[PDB]
Structure formats: C-alpha cells, structure tokens
Design a protein around this nucleic acid. Structure first.
Ligand SMILES: [Mg+2]
Ligand SMILES: [Mg+2]
Ligand SMILES: [Mg+2]
Ligand SMILES: [Mg+2]
Ligand SMILES: [Mg+2]
Ligand SMILES: [Mg+2]
Ligand SMILES: [Mg+2]
Ligand SMILES: [Mg+2]
Ligand SMILES: [Mg+2]
Ligand SMILES: [Mg+2]
Ligand SMILES: [Mg+2]
Ligand SMILES: [Mg+2]
Ligand SMILES: [Mg+2]
Ligand SMILES: [Mg+2]
Ligand SMILES: [Mg+2]
Ligand SMILES: [Mg+2]
Lengths: 324, 118, 138, 52, 168, 177
RNA sequence: AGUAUGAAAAUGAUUAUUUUAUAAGCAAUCAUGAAUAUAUUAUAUUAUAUUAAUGAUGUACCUUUUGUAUAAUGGGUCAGC
RNA sequence: AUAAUAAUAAUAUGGUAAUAGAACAUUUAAUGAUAAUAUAUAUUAGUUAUUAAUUAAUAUAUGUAUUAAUUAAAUAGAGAA
C-alpha cells in the first residue's frame, strides 16, 4: 500500500460529498444540527440545504496558488459543484433583505430623506454587519487544511458543517495582506452565508407560510438598535425649513428668544424657538444666539423627517425630500 | 383609567419591581439582577407582574401594581453569571492573622424584549 | 441640504430572536492521570447523553489529552471560558458544566451599587434642564 | 474509549485519537512519496530531452 | 514588475525599530553615573553636530568621551548610508559598567568608610530628522485632528447611577 | 385640554431644593394609583418623540393631532426676533426687472472694488445675497480675495488656528441633532 | 572561590503613555470624568488595560502592654539562609 | 440504614491566649502512561468562590517530567530575633 493513495481516495470522497451534499452525511454533521437548533429553522429546511448555504462558489483553483512567495496559498477548500453552491440562494437573500428592511424603514419613517434611508438600510444589512451576525450564530470557517484533516482522520460531516470558500492560508502572516478580490474575503463569505440561510428559509416556507421569512428577518435583522436621529447631518437648515414651510400651508418660520442666561460669559445659554405663526416648530438651545437658531432649525427638520406615524393610521406617503 | 396617550406614544418606559427592587426600563434595555434566578433557565421568558409605573414623555399610569390587563412587559433571561471575584482582607491592628473574605456574587442578565400598552 | 452619517446597528440578542449564548462545550480528559477520574466517570455514565438531549443547540466535543481534565465552553460573543476540573467528582463536574452553559460569554466585571439596566435608548422623558423645570429655582 | 456513536445524541461527538507521532509519520511518507514521484518524472523528462 | 497589491501591518514597536537609527556605545569610562547625567541631560534631543560642539566646549571630563562617542556614532551612520547633518540624538543614557572596586577609607578614632570607584558607560541612539521626526510630527498632527473640541454647553455624562427612578 | 388628568411634579419626599440628586427620596414617594400628567422638564431639541413633534408636522389622519400634548407654552408675541433677515421683518420684494439685473451684472464684472455687493444693494433697494445670486464678479477679484484670506490665515499663530478648527468642529456638531 | 545560563529583585540612567506649577497629611480603597494603548465577532452608543481631574472614606507594620498613630520596641531596600 | 450532588424549614458562623478539625505550595522515596502538535520556567491577558491550578499568546530551554494520582516522610512556607 501507499499513504498517498489513501490520502487521494479520501480527498476524492470529500469532493464527492461536497458535490452531492448527501442528506444522511449532512444530518450526521453535529455543527449543522446545532446551528439549526440555535436559529429555530423550519423542519422543512433540510440539513443538506443548510450545508449548501455554507458552501460558497469555488469551481476552479486560482492562479495565486502557484506562488506562496507572493503571499498566498489556497489549500483548505476543495472544488465545488457548479449547480450546488450558495450563489443563487445568496442573491435571493440579498434581494429579500433589500426589500423587507427598506420597507420596514419606510413604514417607521415615511418622510426620511433618501440618502438617510439608504444609510439606515446599509446599517441594518451591510456586509460587515451580516458577517458579524453569522459569527454570532456560529458559522465557523474551514481554516484547517485537507491534508491536516486526513491526518487527523476526521469525517466529511464536520467539513460540510463549516463555511467553505477560497480562504487564503497565510492571509496576514508576518503582517502581510495580499489585497485579493471579494471572492476570497471572509466577511463577504459570512455575509453570503447569512443571506443564503434566509433564501433557503424562504424557499421552504413560501407556499405554506409566506411571511415566515419576513418574521425571521424581523427577529434577527430588524430587531437591532439604530437611532435614526444620529444619521443626519444638515448644512444650511434654516433655509431648508423655510422651503418646507413654503411647500406646506404654513406661515414663514422666524426664530425668537424664549429664554436667555449668562450673556457676557464663557458659556451662555440661549433658548430660541422657530415659530411659524403662533405654533412653535423647533426648539433650539445654544451657547451663542446663532448656534441656538441653527439648533432650532435642525430640530424642526428632525421633527419633519423622523415623524413616525402609528400602525392604526392609513399609509403616509411623503411628498419627497425638501429640494432647497 | 383612560390609558390612550400612553398607548399612542412611540417612546414608553416602565418601572417594574422584582422583589421590591425597582428597575426603570424601555424595550431593548438589559437588566442585571443581583442574584441567581432558580425558577427560570436561560432562554425563558418572564412576564413582569408588579409594574409600579408605566410612563410616556408627559404622562404616567401608576398602580400598586398596575392592572396586568393594561400592558405587556416580557423580559428574556439572557445569561446567569457572576460579578468579578474579590478578596478583601479582614484583620485587627496588632494581629498577624489576616482573614481573607473572598466574594463573587451571582448575577442574572435579563433583556426587556416587549413593552407595550395592550 | 441633508447628508447621512454612515453608522451601524447594535444587536440586542433577546428582543427579536434569542440566540443561545453557549454554542459549544469541549469535555477534555486523560486515560492516565488520577485527576481525570471524575471526568472519565461523567463521560461514561449516561449523563452526557441526557445533557446533549436537553441542549441540542450546544455541540459537545469530547477530547483526550495528557494533562488535567478541562471544560472549555465557547460563546456567541467569541469569548472562551476554560474550567480545569482536576480531582472533582462526577457531580461537581456536572455542576461546573451547568454553570458554563448558564453563562453569557462576557468577561467578569465589578459592578457599582444599583448599576442595573444598560440602555442604548435615549431617555423617554428628556434630560432635565433648569430653564425648562416645573419649579423655577428661587 | 468513547466514540461519537456511543452517546446517541447527534450534537455529542468524540474526536479521533490519532497520535501526533503517527500523523507526523504519515505526513513524512506522503510528502516523501510525492517527491519520489516528481523526481522520477523529472528524470524521465531529462531522458526524453537527451533522446530528442 | 508585478501586479500584486499589498497591505502591511506593523506594531508600534516594529515601526519604532525599523526606522533608520545608529547605536553608539562608549568604552569603560571612569566616572560616576550622576556626573554623566549632569552633562548628558543637556544633549537630549540635539542634532549630533551641535551636541559634539557642546561637548568640545564643555568644562567637564566625561564631555570629551561623550564627544568621541558621538563622532563614532556619526561615522557608523555614514558607513550605513545616513548623513551627519540628518542625525539627531534620540536617546542618550548612562549605566554602571560593573566591577567597581571597594576600598576602605580609614578615619580618625577607629572609624571607617568604604570608598567605591565607579566606572560607567554612555550609550546613545542616533535617529534621523528625515524619517523619525517626520513620523512623530505626523502622529501629532493626527492626534490634533482627532481631538474633540471644547464645547461650551456640551454634552457631559450625567455621572452617578440612576437608582430605578426618574429625578426629572 | 382633551384630558383632565391630575398633574404632578417629579416629587421627592425630601426637600427638592437641597436634595434633588437623592434618588432615595424619589423612590420613597408613592402617589395614588391612576393616570397623571407629568410635564417634561426638558427641551425638545433631540427628541423624535411623538409627544414632542408639532401638529403641523403630524399627518392629517393622525389621532395625535387632536390630543393636547405638543403644548404651546411660549408665545410668539412675547418672544423677540433673533438673527432675522430684513426681508422677514418687512416682506420680500420682487421689483427689479431683467434690464436692472443686466446693468448690475455689467457693473459687478467691471469694478467689484468700486461696485461692491453692499453698494449695489443700497442702489437698487435689494439684498447683498440677492446681488450675489444675480451676478458673479470677475474671477480675478475672487482669486485675489482668496489669496488675501490665505495670507491672513498664515499670519495666525498656532493657537489661533487650533481655535478656528475647534470652532469649525463645534459648528459641524450643531447641525447633527 | 566549579562550569554554563540568567527579562529574580533591590538599585541607576533614558524613552513612551498619562497626571501634575492655588494645594496640606500611611499616599490606599471606593466612587467618577478625561486621555492613551490593545483588541482577526468594536455589530457599538463596544470591552479590557494603564494614568494622584474631581469627590468620599482612611491615625503604617510588628512586638509588649490595662492601654500605642504614638514622640514605647524593632526594621535602609531586596535576594538567599 | 451509604456516598456524592441538589432542594426546602430552622439554628449557628467577631475573636487575643488557648483547644479541635480540614486543606494547599515546596523537596525527597515507592508505583507510573505520555511527548518538540510535548514539557518546564518567566511575562501579559482571560477562567475556576482563586495562598492554588488552568486557558491563550509571547520568550528561552530541553528529545524531555521520579509527571497525574495514592502513600511514606521532611533542613516543608519568613516584613519582624
Ligand atoms: Mg494588623
Ligand atoms: Mg491590644
Ligand atoms: Mg555581568
Ligand atoms: Mg582622615
Ligand atoms: Mg555610600
Ligand atoms: Mg442634606
Ligand atoms: Mg492648578
Ligand atoms: Mg485636615
Ligand atoms: Mg488609640
Ligand atoms: Mg515610632
Ligand atoms: Mg513621627
Ligand atoms: Mg531603628
Ligand atoms: Mg472564626
Ligand atoms: Mg526550612
Ligand atoms: Mg525572603
Ligand atoms: Mg505575612
């Protein structure tokens, strides 16, 4: 006999399992099972599907393997099947995230500016955030080599359970990164995995319970804290407020001193209110008068934009951003 | 009890009491009880019952306790744990014996998942 | 004119879907080594199976090493508790395992008096202001 | 001598007791075997070049 | 001659060490450490040439030795590739050189002391104005940029614990 | 007044003037069970709260419009105008025709040092801002002005530059909310 | 008083971070801002670590005594015994 | 009719001189797997109700614990002469 032959046949078996993701093997994988139990995924979502979601596309081994001298070696993963990876799933998951999150944000804040809305959406479902979520869930990367695994003589089940992409061995050894594309990044792979899981959930539940996916998203993605007030940065807000007042049936906004203390000091306090008629729109405190005025305008704009109506109200469609 | 303004308001706080210890909370807030919970395991949900005050920005319902029907307030038990281990030394002023008073009290991290006017 | 500030969301584990903090536990023992007796007994005696049945979201690795017997947990936040269970009986080991599973992974920390609630949320009522107080000072 | 099958709850498993020395020996044999294979191929290529 | 991009990650210590420097060392100088300090504190962050000049016109005995050391460090820097008008003394310290021979001082009325005879060494690290100084200027600039301003009516944390109750 | 709830201060059992920070007194103070009106002791600057938003910014079908919580405590008659433009005090005027504008533009290009914005404003009974909106100066003049500004900046000490930076940071912070 | 090795401490000089030129006492502890550093799950409104803003409490240790902050005993510091 | 662990109710838990019970560190002797993917020592940060040990990183040594554990013993623990 020969040990090379033994290793080779093991590798071939592993490749075959990757191509298939046979259901029994996937079921045997403890990590997959624990992930399934943790997230409370549907029973219709098979363990093979879950394994596939963790399998990123990796058809051909790249040219950068040829030289570890240039700071890269791809020796962990094994080539995947063209029609059994997380790629199609991932896209679907991304689409779902882009739809649902955005919709939820619009429901919450129907006048939110376009740029601000986009930023909020990004915050909810940015690649980094998605990767973090995946890590939290316990989607671990297949860092160990194939040869090493063979030597240890571990089953293929464990491999199936881990996340599988062209992860560069010696990525940041001796403090040297190679700056490769998105197809070799860990964060991206983790993002894909979390999107792929969502897509798989959708696939299994859509006919029985159409909104199951969206409630899962709400539970995991939309449950996260984001203060929308911290997102804004105005420029000349008084002018913008005046424009808004003009657009609506409101009197011209003027700022007026409500209260004042410590004028002729290092740190005064000036309270000014931007009135439109007798109604106050924005209240603004400040060290200077100018500052206070600015703050009142910004407050007014916040109140305009971040207005969140009740669920009992009929839908509020805003009349666009205030084009100054 | 006309509880309409509270119901309307987007922001809302509660001052529920566990063993007469008040904890002022909103939804998402992460309460740290200074004892080991025996009844609930980790993952279990706690329906708060002795809710003293339920407040908006300008209004507040108050009871001793408030009617359970009027509100919901679900905490989740998100980890039993402990405080950091400390060893203060106890000794008298011309005495070489120095008794070490070791201490490492228990904690229970709750998370206020739901808080709303029913 | 209005511009966004790039900002990211904060995950509150409990509020939507509770992800269980403990993700993996490794039982480590030695075949030699008299300190690993209680661990060995625990591994043998149907308790581990029951445990796994109870908690199917935790994976239970069982390893053999030359040193003292070890219980290393692994949590969602990425931290790792490792308890050496040298010379402990079966029941003590089980208690230790229970303690580990109970833990949210976070580091141990001194709390001051009444440092109870930890909010991301802005106050429902505002922050106090002397100009806006009900009773004016003198 | 525990095993993954012994526990009958699929989240429990026992990692394989393969001695470090044995693994090292296996590695040595495989890399050596590869080297042997390569060297023979290179020799053959040299012979072919010499021929024509 | 390549299309491979890279990103380098280095510790603070690694950054410090890799900047071009030169390490002068004296021989076994006959002096006290205190006496050396009394001079060496003057030659803190000087340009090497300035320091050498100061040593030349100093009244102290260690001064000549210090000057010689500086000259040697300059020569070393030149040999390496550096310039003498670029070099500044980054660090310069002293230490005991060991094996100080004690020797009893006999006093009146059957009393004694012990006279030690101290030997020291001066080492110094010369660094470049062209790199190290530029780097620390850049760092200072970054720190300045980072620095949050003084706000007059600014958001200071309401220090103290809440106590499970609104006080407003 | 829609709601007729009794109103309460944030009451301590202790002397509030001497022990406002003492949480214990607040904890002690029990009040009879029911609904109350505790008006907030706060400015409504950073608040997105629904009790803080004004009625004009609420939607027409909002139930909250009718409820009396965006309280108009202040009165615009009593408050005096702060950093208000002369157009806001005495109304906007749209009197200048195209010919006048063209003349202004011609003047400004010709000699911005002689025919400055303020002078133009004085002539035509209109704002300097409006003059600016109407007409660009000769780009040379602008360049000169920029150069002068740069020279002034250079003339500063280190401290002054830092102070200016701090001021800029503060200004940026104002518009955050 | 063997030979190798020696980031053991006391001790000296130097550099870095941080605090410090209107503040008074075992120099610590607890509260609590700020600044800096590290952090291949800081997702952050993050976590740890270092640091005499500021506040509160705080009469070295042993021995011997009815009783010691005592201005009663004894100790210059660390290492080995 | 025991032991270990966990519940509930009750009572008790300041301590000089003193009495009693239970542990740990260190060194040697008896028995004794294992191994540079290991062991030992040090530093830093975690972990276990913590004089102790353990995890990780880093450093230096060593082809390796008279190692875990149970016994037997002691030139067996030092801010106090
Ligand atoms: Mg004492
Ligand atoms: Mg006494
Ligand atoms: Mg020597
Ligand atoms: Mg004499
Ligand atoms: Mg002397
Ligand atoms: Mg008082
Ligand atoms: Mg001062
Ligand atoms: Mg005094
Ligand atoms: Mg006394
Ligand atoms: Mg004395
Ligand atoms: Mg004295
Ligand atoms: Mg003395
Ligand atoms: Mg006692
Ligand atoms: Mg002894
Ligand atoms: Mg000693
Ligand atoms: Mg002692």
């Amino acid at each position: 006999e020969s040990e090379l032959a033994k290793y080779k046949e093991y590798y071939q078996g592993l490749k075959s399992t990757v191509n298939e993701i046979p259901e029994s093997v996937a079921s045997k994988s403890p990590s997959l099972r624990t992930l399934h139990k943790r997230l409370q995924l549907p029973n219709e979502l098979t363990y093979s599907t879950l394994s596939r979601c963790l399998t990123c596309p990796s058809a051909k081994l790249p040219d950068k393997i040829n030289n570890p001298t240039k700071g890269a070696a791809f020796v962990n993963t094994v080539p995947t099947n063209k029609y059994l990876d997380n790629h199609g799933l991932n896209i679907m998951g991304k689409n779902l995230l882009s739809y649902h999150v955005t919709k939820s944000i619009i429901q919450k804040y129907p006048r939110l500016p376009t740029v601000v809305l986009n930023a909020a959406v990004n915050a909810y479902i940015s690649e980094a955030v998605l990767a973090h979520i995946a890590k939290y869930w316990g989607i671990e990367v297949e860092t160990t080599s194939v040869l090493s695994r063979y030597l240890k003589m571990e089953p293929f089940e464990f491999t199936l359970g881990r996340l599988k992409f062209f992860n560069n061995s010696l990525n940041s050894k001796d403090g040297i990164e190679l700056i490769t594309g998105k197809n070799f990044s860990e964060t991206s792979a983790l993002a894909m995995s979390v999107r792929s899981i969502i897509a798989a959930i959708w696939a299994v539940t859509e006919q029985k319970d159409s909104q199951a996916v969206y409630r899962f998203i709400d539970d995991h993605i939309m449950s996260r804290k984001l203060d929308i007030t911290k997102m804004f940065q105005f420029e000349q807000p008084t002018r913008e407020l005046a424009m808004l007042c003009r657009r609506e049936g409101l009197e011209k906004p003027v700022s007026k001193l409500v209260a004042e203390s410590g004028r002729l000091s290092k740190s005064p306090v000036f309270i000014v209110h931007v009135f439109s008629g007798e109604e106050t729109l924005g209240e603004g405190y400040g060290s200077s008068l100018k500052e206070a005025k600015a703050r009142a305008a910004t407050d007014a704009l916040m109140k305009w934009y971040c207005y969140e109506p009740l669920a009992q109200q009929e839908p509020v469609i805003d009349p666009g951003t205030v084009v100054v | 009890t006309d509880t309409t303004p509270l119901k309307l308001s987007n922001e809302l706080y509660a001052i529920f009491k566990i063993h007469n210890r008040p904890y002022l909370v909103t939804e998402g807030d992460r309460v740290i009880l200074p004892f080991k919970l025996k009844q609930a395991e980790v993952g279990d949900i706690l329906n708060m019952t002795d809710v003293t005050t339920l407040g908006s920005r300008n209004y507040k319902l108050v009871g001793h306790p408030i009617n359970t029907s009027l509100y919901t307030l679900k905490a989740t038990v998100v980890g039993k744990t402990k405080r950091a281990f400390q060893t203060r030394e106890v000794t008298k002023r011309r005495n070489r014996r120095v008794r070490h008073a070791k201490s490492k009290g228990d904690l229970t991290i709750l998370r206020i998942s739901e808080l709303s006017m029913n | 004119v209005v511009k966004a500030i790039a900002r990211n969301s904060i995950g509150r584990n409990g509020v939507g879907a509770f992800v269980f903090p403990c993700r993996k536990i490794t039982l480590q023992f030695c075949n030699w080594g008299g300190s690993s007796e209680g661990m060995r007994k625990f591994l043998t005696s149907k308790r581990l199976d029951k445990w796994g049945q109870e908690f199917p979201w935790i994976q239970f690795e069982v390893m053999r090493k030359s040193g003292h017997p070890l219980l290393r947990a692994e949590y969602t936040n990425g931290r790792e508790k490792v308890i050496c269970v040298r010379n402990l009986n079966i029941d003590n080991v089980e208690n230790k395992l229970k303690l580990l599973k109970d833990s949210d992974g976070d580091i141990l920390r001194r709390r001051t008096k009444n440092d109870n609630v930890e909010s991301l949320n802005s106050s429902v009522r505002g922050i106090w202001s002397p100009l806006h107080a009900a009773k004016r000072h003198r | 001598h525990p095993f993954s099958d012994n526990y009958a709850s699929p989240n429990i498993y026992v990692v394989n007791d393969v001695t470090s020395k044995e693994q090292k020996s296996k590695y040595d044999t495989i890399m050596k075997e590869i080297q042997k294979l390569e060297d023979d191929a290179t020799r053959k290529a040299l012979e072919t070049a010499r021929s024509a | 001659n390549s299309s491979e991009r890279y990103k380098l990650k280095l510790t603070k210590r690694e950054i410090e060490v890799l900047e071009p420097s030169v390490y002068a060392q004296s021989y076994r100088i006959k002096s006290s450490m205190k006496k050396a300090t009394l001079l060496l504190r003057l030659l803190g962050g000087l340009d090497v040439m300035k320091a050498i000049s100061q040593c030349h016109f100093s009244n102290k005995k260690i001064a000549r030795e210090v000057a010689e050391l500086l000259q040697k460090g300059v020569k070393d820097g030149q040999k390496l590739g550096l310039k003498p008008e670029d070099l500044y003394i980054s660090q310069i310290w002293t230490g005991s050189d060991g094996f100080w021979r004690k020797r009893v001082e006999f006093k009146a009325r059957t009393r004694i002391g012990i006279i030690s005879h101290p030997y020291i060494h001066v080492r110094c690290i010369l660094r470049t104005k062209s790199v190290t100084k530029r780097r620390l200027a850049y760092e200072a600039h970054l720190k300045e940029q980072k620095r949050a301003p003084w706000v007059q009516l600014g958001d200071k944390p309401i220090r103290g614990v809440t106590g499970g109750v609104y006080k407003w | 007044k829609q709601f007729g709830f009794p109103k309460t201060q944030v009451t301590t059992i202790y002397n509030k003037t001497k022990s406002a920070s003492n949480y214990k007194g607040y904890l002690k103070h029990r009040d009879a069970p029911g609904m109350y009106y505790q008006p907030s002791e706060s400015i409504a600057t950073g608040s997105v709260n629904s009790e803080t938003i004004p009625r004009s910014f609420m939607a027409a079908s909002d139930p909250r419009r009718g409820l009396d919580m965006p309280v108009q405590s202040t009165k615009a008659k009593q408050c005096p105008n702060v950093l208000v433009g002369k157009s806001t005090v005495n109304g906007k005027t749209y009197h200048l025709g195209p010919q006048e504008i063209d003349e202004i533009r011609k003047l400004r290009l010709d000699n911005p040092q002689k025919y400055t914005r303020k002078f133009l404003a004085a002539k035509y009974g209109i704002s300097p801002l409006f003059v600016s909106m109407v007409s660009k100066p000769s780009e040379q003049h602008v360049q000169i002005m920029e150069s002068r500004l740069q020279e002034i900046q250079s003339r500063w000490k280190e401290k002054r530059r830092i102070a200016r930076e701090d001021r800029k940071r503060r200004k940026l912070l104002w518009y955050q909310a």
